[PDB]
Design an enzyme around this catalytic site. Structure first.
Site, PDB file in Angstrom:
ATOM      1  N   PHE A 187      27.273  -3.649 -16.764  1.00  0.00           N
ATOM      2  CA  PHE A 187      27.245  -5.089 -16.985  1.00  0.00           C
ATOM      3  C   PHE A 187      27.333  -5.468 -18.484  1.00  0.00           C
ATOM      4  CE2 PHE A 187      25.831  -5.541 -12.640  1.00  0.00           C
ATOM      5  CZ  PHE A 187      26.151  -6.864 -12.266  1.00  0.00           C
ATOM      6  N   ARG A 217      17.422 -12.413 -25.245  1.00  0.00           N
ATOM      7  CA  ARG A 217      16.397 -12.539 -24.236  1.00  0.00           C
ATOM      8  C   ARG A 217      16.099 -11.112 -23.708  1.00  0.00           C
ATOM      9  NH1 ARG A 217      17.227 -13.307 -18.027  1.00  0.00           N
ATOM     10  NH2 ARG A 217      14.902 -13.592 -17.605  1.00  0.00           N
ATOM     11  N   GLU A 260      21.238 -15.509 -17.348  1.00  0.00           N
ATOM     12  CA  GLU A 260      22.059 -14.352 -16.908  1.00  0.00           C
ATOM     13  C   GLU A 260      23.351 -14.865 -16.386  1.00  0.00           C
ATOM     14  OE1 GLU A 260      20.162 -11.131 -14.339  1.00  0.00           O
ATOM     15  OE2 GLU A 260      18.429 -12.428 -14.751  1.00  0.00           O
ATOM     16  N   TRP A 299      24.537 -11.701 -19.114  1.00  0.00           N
ATOM     17  CA  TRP A 299      23.958 -10.414 -18.661  1.00  0.00           C
ATOM     18  C   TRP A 299      25.125  -9.391 -18.634  1.00  0.00           C
ATOM     19  CZ3 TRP A 299      19.089  -8.509 -17.949  1.00  0.00           C
ATOM     20  CH2 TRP A 299      19.035  -7.125 -17.552  1.00  0.00           C
ATOM     21  N   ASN A 332      19.975 -17.898 -13.456  1.00  0.00           N
ATOM     22  CA  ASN A 332      20.688 -16.612 -13.527  1.00  0.00           C
ATOM     23  C   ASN A 332      21.794 -16.759 -12.485  1.00  0.00           C
ATOM     24  OD1 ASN A 332      18.833 -15.577 -15.320  1.00  0.00           O
ATOM     25  ND2 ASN A 332      17.417 -15.053 -13.680  1.00  0.00           N
ATOM     26  N   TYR A 378      25.724 -15.688 -10.853  1.00  0.00           N
ATOM     27  CA  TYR A 378      26.806 -14.736 -10.808  1.00  0.00           C
ATOM     28  C   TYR A 378      27.948 -15.208  -9.934  1.00  0.00           C
ATOM     29  CZ  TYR A 378      23.792 -11.558 -13.267  1.00  0.00           C
ATOM     30  OH  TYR A 378      23.029 -10.987 -14.238  1.00  0.00           O
ATOM     31  N   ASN A 408      11.177 -13.413 -13.972  1.00  0.00           N
ATOM     32  CA  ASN A 408      12.645 -13.423 -13.788  1.00  0.00           C
ATOM     33  C   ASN A 408      13.008 -13.099 -12.362  1.00  0.00           C
ATOM     34  OD1 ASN A 408      15.361 -13.398 -15.371  1.00  0.00           O
ATOM     35  ND2 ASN A 408      15.483 -11.688 -13.970  1.00  0.00           N
ATOM     36  N   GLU A 409      13.824 -13.959 -11.768  1.00  0.00           N
ATOM     37  CA  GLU A 409      14.325 -13.789 -10.390  1.00  0.00           C
ATOM     38  C   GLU A 409      13.320 -13.522  -9.273  1.00  0.00           C
ATOM     39  OE1 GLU A 409      17.789 -11.267 -10.294  1.00  0.00           O
ATOM     40  OE2 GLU A 409      18.929 -12.803 -11.338  1.00  0.00           O
ATOM     41  N   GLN A 446      15.385  -1.626 -17.665  1.00  0.00           N
ATOM     42  CA  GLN A 446      16.790  -1.314 -17.517  1.00  0.00           C
ATOM     43  C   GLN A 446      17.412  -0.595 -18.769  1.00  0.00           C
ATOM     44  OE1 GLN A 446      17.450  -5.329 -15.590  1.00  0.00           O
ATOM     45  NE2 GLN A 446      19.080  -4.145 -14.553  1.00  0.00           N
ATOM     46  N   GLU A 500      21.301  -0.507 -13.447  1.00  0.00           N
ATOM     47  CA  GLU A 500      21.416  -1.591 -12.507  1.00  0.00           C
ATOM     48  C   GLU A 500      20.668  -1.239 -11.193  1.00  0.00           C
ATOM     49  OE1 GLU A 500      22.221  -4.602 -12.820  1.00  0.00           O
ATOM     50  OE2 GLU A 500      22.684  -5.288 -10.678  1.00  0.00           O
ATOM     51  N   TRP A 501      19.348  -1.071 -11.293  1.00  0.00           N
ATOM     52  CA  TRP A 501      18.475  -0.904 -10.083  1.00  0.00           C
ATOM     53  C   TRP A 501      19.056   0.055  -9.061  1.00  0.00           C
ATOM     54  CZ3 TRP A 501      14.443  -2.501 -12.403  1.00  0.00           C
ATOM     55  CH2 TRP A 501      14.470  -3.690 -13.234  1.00  0.00           C
ATOM     56  N   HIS A 504       9.538  -8.600 -15.474  1.00  0.00           N
ATOM     57  CA  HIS A 504      10.878  -8.441 -14.969  1.00  0.00           C
ATOM     58  C   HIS A 504      10.862  -7.223 -13.980  1.00  0.00           C
ATOM     59  CE1 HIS A 504      15.268  -8.348 -14.742  1.00  0.00           C
ATOM     60  NE2 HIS A 504      15.422  -9.186 -15.758  1.00  0.00           N
TER      61      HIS A 504
HETATM   62  O1  LIG Z   1      22.343 -10.001  -4.730  1.00  0.00           O
HETATM   63  N1  LIG Z   1      21.987 -11.006  -5.650  1.00  0.00           N
HETATM   64  O2  LIG Z   1      22.204 -12.346  -5.379  1.00  0.00           O
HETATM   65  C1  LIG Z   1      21.445 -10.634  -6.802  1.00  0.00           C
HETATM   66  C2  LIG Z   1      21.053 -11.555  -7.752  1.00  0.00           C
HETATM   67  C3  LIG Z   1      20.489 -11.127  -8.922  1.00  0.00           C
HETATM   68  C4  LIG Z   1      20.324  -9.756  -9.071  1.00  0.00           C
HETATM   69  O3  LIG Z   1      19.769  -9.252 -10.164  1.00  0.00           O
HETATM   70  C5  LIG Z   1      20.679  -8.856  -8.099  1.00  0.00           C
HETATM   71  N2  LIG Z   1      20.484  -7.525  -8.262  1.00  0.00           N
HETATM   72  O4  LIG Z   1      19.891  -7.043  -9.410  1.00  0.00           O
HETATM   73  O5  LIG Z   1      20.882  -6.675  -7.312  1.00  0.00           O
HETATM   74  C6  LIG Z   1      21.281  -9.287  -6.941  1.00  0.00           C
HETATM   75  C1  LIG Z   2      19.882 -10.365 -13.193  1.00  0.00           C
HETATM   76  O1  LIG Z   2      20.976  -9.740 -12.451  1.00  0.00           O
HETATM   77  C2  LIG Z   2      21.400  -8.552 -13.126  1.00  0.00           C
HETATM   78  C3  LIG Z   2      22.685  -8.153 -12.451  1.00  0.00           C
HETATM   79  O2  LIG Z   2      22.415  -7.818 -11.049  1.00  0.00           O
HETATM   80  C4  LIG Z   2      20.265  -7.519 -13.041  1.00  0.00           C
HETATM   81  O3  LIG Z   2      20.579  -6.347 -13.736  1.00  0.00           O
HETATM   82  C5  LIG Z   2      19.025  -8.088 -13.724  1.00  0.00           C
HETATM   83  O4  LIG Z   2      17.937  -7.204 -13.792  1.00  0.00           O
HETATM   84  C6  LIG Z   2      18.645  -9.486 -13.043  1.00  0.00           C
HETATM   85  F1  LIG Z   2      17.588  -9.960 -13.827  1.00  0.00           F
END
Ligand SMILES: O=[N+]([O-])c1ccc(O)c([N+](=O)[O-])c1
Ligand SMILES: *[C@H]1O[C@H](CO)[C@@H](O)[C@H](O)[C@H]1F
Ligand SMILES: O=[N+]([O-])c1ccc(O)c([N+](=O)[O-])c1
Ligand SMILES: O=[N+]([O-])c1ccc(O)c([N+](=O)[O-])c1
Ligand SMILES: O=[N+]([O-])c1ccc(O)c([N+](=O)[O-])c1
Ligand SMILES: *[C@H]1O[C@H](CO)[C@@H](O)[C@H](O)[C@H]1F
Ligand SMILES: *[C@H]1O[C@H](CO)[C@@H](O)[C@H](O)[C@H]1F
Ligand SMILES: *[C@H]1O[C@H](CO)[C@@H](O)[C@H](O)[C@H]1F
Lengths: 486, 486, 486, 486
Positions: free
Chosen positions: C458, C88, C394, C442, C319, C321, C177-178, C30, C449-450, C132
């Site tokens: 962010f 991190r 995050e 984060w 992580n 949000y 991660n995730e 990223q 952001e993907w 990641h």
């Molecule tokens: O949609 N989500 O719950 C979620 C969670 C973590 C994430 O990192 C992302 N993301 O990168 O798009 C999405």
């Molecule tokens: C955690 O969520 C953030 C926000 O969507 C992403 O950018 C990261 O890559 C994910 F690890």
């Protein structure tokens, strides 16, 4: 009969964290003496005792007091002997700036530097009160002291001189001590310097306005505070290691009777006693109850002032002694306020609806023992005002001169028991999550108790007036030595 | 989307004691018609529609309404078909005393006697509202109606005529319905009869004082109430089997944001909305918050009046629809009240701090569904005001004429679901110990909704305007028939 | 309207223990850029942007990003300027082993060593994410990457190379991660690299199986994790001073409506979102709800694998949000799952039964502010899963490029307020006994952001794309500098 | 040792409201005898004892039982002597319709009319179970009884005949008793009539399918129930004074060990034991846990069936004896269900994780005393399922023939103590708000306990087999006479 704690209920030092701070307090006028030495100017309190000596109960004054201007090393020694970690003392404005403004008095400065350096030499941290009722009489003569906004800038300059002279070593400050007591007594009842009250009331100078002068003085204190704190944060906190706040007198309140009216009265008592000054440093305005009841007698803040006041304390001091019952008074045709404290519409009663006093008398007529009131106020701080860092910056009792049930001034088991109960009440608050960081007994040494003179002894350490003002440890002080593992 | 209760969550009659009372309400101006028949005098509402017809949204009035003056037997039949145990209706002052004072109109009396006797024949208990906004225009012309103290004695005489004519059969009375709504709308905003407001505001008669006239009218209502209740207890309750009280409009309140300020605002909202009239019948004075904020605009009671008012209700009605968020307003230089409701220093918000509305809209713009607010107010009654006997004397929703999501006026699943949730909220309060004795839906039949005319339908029973004002049971009404096991 | 905290409600550093850790996160793809320099191999994300650039909303990619491969010293500087204690970051697998397997790229290693040594020089602790989303495209081409068990051993070797190269200095690791976001987006919806989904769905490569590929990838992640942790504990923790865990994406859930069905749906949402990956590292198997609903599509662990997985984390990252409402879906004839997330039988709703959104929108369409959901999940960790050591690895919000209500990219009061509320929610959990050890925002810096590219910012620190990718502190970052007393 | 209640802990009748109902239960096959008199057809239980007599433990059958077909007046007398207010008995389908369908047997009808009229003569209310395991063997031979949907309409017709014959006097009905016990024992283990199980299991007729036949039978019961209740409400409740429901066998469950897995297992045990049949009459579908684990073996309801089932009980019976520990079983490769009860993935254990049995044994091997389990289930009814009206329609213990610690069949202090503890547990639930309306002991008289024959005595009243089947009051019965103030 005065029932003591059972021995297994007595606080131990380990009840409290290692960073928690035990200490004692004094103030400049109450202990220093030397009221005209080395260039020191007179204060409102010098003037008020010298012009109205009959307003001191026992005919005394503070011209010499404990003589701490010369005997400060014995004050330090007594703190070290009790094992105290902190000493909270005040700076005499008039000693350091004899005219309020202008040329600093270098001997005045040297004195504080000597005390400060001695404390540090002895492992004791100085916590400093900038102003403790103690206004230069030159500013009182020139513009009426706290009644004129010129006090704001003059105080700012005094505070700055403190930061410059002492801030490399002193890292914890209180701008003002007990604004509510000061406003009510000095400008409402007028029993304290400069002694003002409404025409027709009994005070030294009945030329004032008991419904207006307290609020005027108060408002300038708060503006003075905001200016000094702004100046401090901008130019005197370069390491970010210094903290500044204000210390408030507070009484606990309980509703007089089980009634939603007395519940409402209780919240007005607390706004008036505590929120008067605390709600400005929290949100930048007075409590709504006060604005609604006091109206045009209570000055408005500007937007700049609101924002400068809000969040202006890093630390808060609570000076706690006692509690009262709060009894609801109706707004009616037949009733008009005469003293500022009437504006709460809640009378403070020492006896409750069931005919009982709130707690046992401890010596002086106004200190009824009610440690629960302290835990309660600490939980209000936590739940209502954001749990800021609290120091108990005063707590203690008087022994009254000539009282036949306190014939030996060193055998102060009664003071010791009250202090142990209050420390235990602070532990209760901490266990319930209140952010309490220290406990400072009032007072380190017997001292001049304002309108009561020396006849009210508040010290952990006896001041032997017949033996050259010598410092002698009382039973309470000796308990602290053990408690602090000395 | 409007989410309904799951079927296992729907109230059953057995949730409630055998003595608990289910019923419905109406008022005279809203249903009776026959506005000038059989000697009836005009009311302020006849006058206000006839002189300011443009102040009714949909261009209608109450000249005929549901025509219950002639069709009352169908109102009785609809109550019997739903299985209701109680009917709460009002007496038209002007029908029974065309001039406000003097000679009773015998046909007016006969009418009520006919309704009363028909209810009793059909096993239904009459609960009677003496006054429901409905003042003779002769008293309005003669001395300005509720704005003059002469209303007090004139109301007393009207009440007495009710007790004499109907008290052998009617045993439950409400002196006044919704004083707070009445004062705010009729004399503050002026959208209701007689239509008064301050110069420069938009109402039919901008010759009034939106900061004073509401309190004047209110104070006379309360004095009128105390006189009538004194007279009732002294001369019209010989068996001791009769009860008399008042019915209050109430909104629930939640703090707008998590803040001790909004906590304080919330308590001011409730004092202003509910305590305005309820705290006088409880303790004989207005809430302290109101006296403190409103001062000389809020009249004082004499001692005789205080004591006559205190404990003057055997029963209280709560008329509940909805709730709001309460948001704190500061007392400041730049802000002055213009409407009486500004004197709470708390704005009623439909949306909270997180940006969400308090609950779903139900049809008319001001009824947001929030049954929790009702349980909350019922617990305040219990905990603060002594748990007196409460009837929910109004509760319900409107279907709005022409709303595309309510195209069939009989398919009122939305009303049914709201009513089931509120009955369930009353059960919650009763389980927590609140002394609730009955639930009366507003309204028995679609009726003239004041400034909204017929366009807001509140009935359990549809009034078919295109079919001769015929009564037709809606889905809600049919649920009640089953619920009441008919 | 977006309501901020009252100033007395704003977290202070002292709310938290002295050992509690504040930090920020990033990931390699990223921020790093330099996507083909110094021998670096391509990743699935290089490939996916280069072959399917239209799948990035704003037409961008990570070829250069924040250019942290060359500007890392500015990332370190920004952490030091905010006073952060922890950073991190992730290791790019393809930078250090261009082919996934075999010869290490010495320049890739030098880079991480440079960042690591710079952090340590500056008093900042490195916490490292090994993987990641960032898989070498050589392994993707050779055997389909995470879809083949050969990924298990290849990952193990990569992890080992990390431990060998960096473990003398790095003492805290996250293997993955995730995993849940990764499996759902990369193999279910297919909006993330390598972009796979079932035939007939809209993703770059609709040649996959949205009901099977997510579970296959997931299962290999978990097996890869268990192998790496076994290897770590056996050969790379000789001082016993190192800790290893995994970081999980989690949403809070509330039941859509008051219904035992939605209570059940809520527990299925949490199993599917959090328990999918967390319940294996706790007990060595997936949640029972998942095995019951997913059956043969969810691979079985062997006994050796169960035992290697159970208790395999010293630390867990959450992580967090946002939150959703969970709404019950019935098992029925007419319904079959099409995406893996359908297998929960619980739809995630942004609006609840009363028609309100769960909390305020914060910028990007999927981040609704609901700090309570975080405290709730932290209490589940405590009460259900044994209270293991939690880091919030995050937490944060996006500002969306071109949004007219965020016209100045440095004035991020909205981000600051969200972060203060979440830190305060972490304090709530800690006061209730949850073992939370740190909070990492984060992101440290605006980054790729993907699927949204750079259009979602962010960062605490702005990356000025028009000024040479320069780092500029936003208002949030400046608050942290004060909070951390810099 | 079996510890009894202290005397001050023994329930008194006044613990319960005046409308609360104490009674006792029996069923037709268990007490009536006369299995082929007056035209009565054979049932599945006649057939099963006559064809597989070795499946009754003690070699007996129900050909004569308590001979209540001739001695019913003594059953009535024993209820009157204990002061019972209610008698819950069942109608033998085969006595009243010998062929299942067609011509009613007038003597069968006369019999029930005689019992009904005798109860009413004696001030006892009849509560009637329509079906109690008791299916005509003609329907079993014709289409396999409950395994074919033709049972649905045939049951409907039988129920209708009951409503027509007895509904002018009987106002409370249960359609079915213990569907879960019936399905598990008759078609899973096959120990009960018609005795079916999977090939290779040990039951009279191992030609069935222990994973499918229980669900098929169950589904038809539920469809039969919905049809009968629809018919009842539409044509047999003209006064609206009649109530209809179903009675469920329930065990209490506690988690085997402190583990979130056993918490989950416990909720699956309760769904499987209670929710199997109760969740259909509440919401019109089976518990989600069951559909997820049982899939295509568990039939789907149509939408018409869902809606007919939901809210189909006015009253619910809970038949409670005992509790178990619930122990989590994993979904795994090596495990497949063989009995329907395996589909819960939760084994019922009589001993808990600490090695202790759940409560004391009371006589028969499966009745462990655990009154807390009953209060718990009653609170689930209240909190989860809407607090519908509950009757405890069975509760009691067996004395086992030849047990040396119960040598005198009338000295049943152990039964009395268990019943007093359970009545006291019902009081606990009522105090916590559970809507419990009655307590019916199983059984009024010793009777044929299915696979255990007469060797398990459950009566309050002894049936002296050596003295002409004479009724003799046991100690328990005599306590009830006093309790009910006879
Ligand atoms: O949609 N989500 O719950 C979620 C969670 C973590 C994430 O990192 C992302 N993301 O990168 O798009 C999405
Ligand atoms: C955690 O969520 C953030 C926000 O969507 C992403 O950018 C990261 O890559 C994910 F690890
Ligand atoms: O009366 N008081 O509450 C009170 C409080 C603090 C005080 O310091 C004093 N005082 O010095 O007299 C009095
Ligand atoms: O707006 N209100 O709160 C409110 C209450 C009761 C009411 O009756 C009315 N009303 O008739 O318009 C309005
Ligand atoms: O084993 N049981 O749980 C259970 C329940 C009710 C019952 O009636 C029976 N029974 O008759 O064998 C057994
Ligand atoms: C705190 O109270 C004590 C006791 O009244 C006074 O002596 C101090 O000056 C005041 F600050
Ligand atoms: C109660 O409120 C209803 C609904 O607004 C009005 O129609 C009534 O007259 C008032 F009493
Ligand atoms: C209730 O359980 C008792 C005791 O097992 C059985 O005899 C009944 O038939 C059943 F309905």
């Amino acid at each position: 009969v005065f029932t003591k704690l059972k021995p297994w209920q007595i606080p131990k030092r380990d009840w409290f964290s290692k960073d928690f701070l035990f200490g004692a307090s004094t103030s400049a006028y109450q202990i220093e003496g030397a009221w005209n030495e080395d260039g020191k100017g007179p204060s409102t309190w010098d003037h008020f005792c010298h012009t109205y000596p009959e307003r001191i109960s026992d005919g005394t004054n503070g011209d010499v007091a404990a003589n701490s201007y010369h005997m400060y090393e014995e004050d330090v020694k007594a703190l070290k002997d009790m094992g105290m970690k902190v000493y909270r003392f005040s700076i005499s404005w008039s000693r350091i700036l004899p005219n309020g403004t202008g040329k600093p008095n270098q001997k005045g400065i040297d004195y504080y530097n000597n005390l400060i350096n001695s404390l540090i030499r002895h492992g004791i941290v100085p916590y400093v009160t900038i102003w403790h009722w103690d206004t230069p009489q030159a500013l009182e003569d020139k513009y009426g002291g706290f009644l004129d906004k010129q006090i704001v800038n003059d105080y700012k300059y005094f505070a700055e001189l403190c930061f410059q002279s002492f801030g490399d070593r002193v890292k914890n400050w209180f701008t003002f001590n007990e604004p509510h007591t000061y406003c009510c007594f000095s400008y409402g009842e007028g029993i304290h310097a400069p002694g003002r009250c409404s025409p027709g009331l009994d005070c030294a100078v009945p030329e004032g306005d008991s419904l207006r002068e307290p609020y005027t003085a108060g408002h300038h204190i708060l503006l003075a505070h905001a200016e000094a704190v702004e100046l401090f944060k901008a130019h005197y906190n370069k390491h970010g290691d210094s903290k500044i706040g204000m210390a408030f007198d507070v009484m606990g309140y309980e509703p007089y009777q089980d009634s939603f009216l007395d519940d409402q009265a209780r919240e007005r008592s607390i706004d008036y006693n505590m929120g008067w000054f605390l709600e400005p440093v929290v949100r930048g305005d007075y409590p709504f109850s006060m604005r609604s009841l006091i109206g045009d007698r209570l000055p408005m803040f500007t937007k700049e002032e609101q924002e400068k006041l809000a969040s202006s304390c890093d630390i808060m001091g609570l000076n706690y002694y006692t509690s009262r019952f709060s009894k609801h008074v109706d707004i009616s045709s037949d009733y008009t306020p005469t003293l500022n404290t009437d504006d709460a519409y809640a009378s403070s009663e020492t006896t409750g609806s069931d005919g009982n006093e709130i707690g046992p008398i401890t010596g002086t007529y106004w200190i009824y023992m009610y440690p629960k009131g302290l835990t309660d106020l600490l939980l209000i701080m936590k739940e209502k005002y954001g749990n800021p860092p609290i120091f108990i910056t005063e707590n203690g009792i008087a022994d009254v001169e000539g009282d036949p049930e306190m014939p030996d001034p060193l055998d102060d088991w009664k003071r010791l028991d009250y202090l142990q109960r209050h420390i235990s009440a602070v532990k209760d608050a901490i266990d319930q999550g209140a952010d309490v960081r220290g406990h400072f007994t009032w007072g380190l040494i017997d001292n001049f108790e304002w309108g009561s003179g020396y006849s009210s002894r508040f010290g952990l350490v006896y001041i032997d007036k017949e033996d050259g003002n010598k410092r002698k440890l009382k039973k309470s002080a000796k308990w602290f030595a053990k408690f602090n593992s000395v």
